[PDB]
Symmetry: C2
Subunit: 164 residues, 2 copies
């Protein structure tokens, strides 16, 4: 743990005190005969690193709905807001991800900051359900199934497998 | 920030959650549609690193007098006890540092774990006060003083400087 210089009120001595760890602040500086005392950051406040400060930092305002906290206001961290899962941030607030329709599939997973990117299923794959998450699935292999392709598949359906 | 695997009670799904930062613990695991929620360690408790645990660690018992805390019980740290300044630990508890008598001086600064080490002042130095802190001081330079040595010094006194 590191140190900081402090000027002693009563004597004018420049002391070398021990820093307080992240999550605490200095509630009593060291003097020529006693060590500095650290206290924990009160509710509502934080300090990110080992410090010598006298009051902890204030946490930001609460997250504006529909945003939620991916980090809380705690001793060591300011609160951090995010759009909840299945939404992404655009301008002001939160929009739901694109839902890829049947016959399309996710090419790029949507994130808290970018929307999902869809592509039409390529030949040999299909997607049969609307989803903002699912990829195009490859057809069931009929050859390696001991069966044959009764009905071909489409970008929306699997091929159907059987005999004769 | 890192992650941890968790088995979802209702579905049996093995999820990948986000760890909670040091000083917090996981108060709600992530599910398939919502992020894990972190809470700050309650008073009395701590977590040292980013974790996935469900209750914070308990702080050790209070420091037995005359020991005092060089680190407090806080969100990020267990309390850490030390012998106060001017004492050092031996066996059970705390003993005051050796006080180097007049004519001796500190060779090794005393610490919270070792006592002071004294040596007799070497020729040309003196120490005129009992102290568990002070070094032998070199005599005042009479030559470079424009004065001469009226009375020689001793291991306890400075030489005294003047003219004629």
């Amino acid at each position: 743990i590191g140190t900081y210089r402090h000027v002693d009120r009563a004597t004018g001595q420049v002391l070398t005190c021990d820093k307080c760890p992240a999550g605490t602040y200095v509630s009593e500086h060291c003097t020529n005969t006693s060590l500095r005392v650290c206290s924990s950051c009160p509710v509502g406040t934080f300090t990110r690193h080992e410090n010598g400060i006298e009051k902890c930092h204030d946490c930001s305002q609460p997250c504006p709905w529909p945003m939620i906290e991916k980090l809380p206001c705690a001793a060591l961290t300011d609160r951090e807001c995010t759009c909840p899962p299945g939404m992404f941030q655009s301008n002001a607030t939160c929009a739901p991800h694109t839902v890829c329709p049947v016959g399309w599939g996710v090419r790029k997973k949507g994130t808290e900051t970018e929307d999902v990117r869809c592509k039409q299923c390529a030949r040999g794959t299909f997607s049969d359900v609307p989803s903002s998450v699912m990829k195009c699935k490859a057809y069931t292999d009929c050859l390696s199934q001991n069966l044959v392709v009764i009905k071909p598949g489409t970008k929306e359906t699997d091929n159907v497998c059987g005999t004769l």
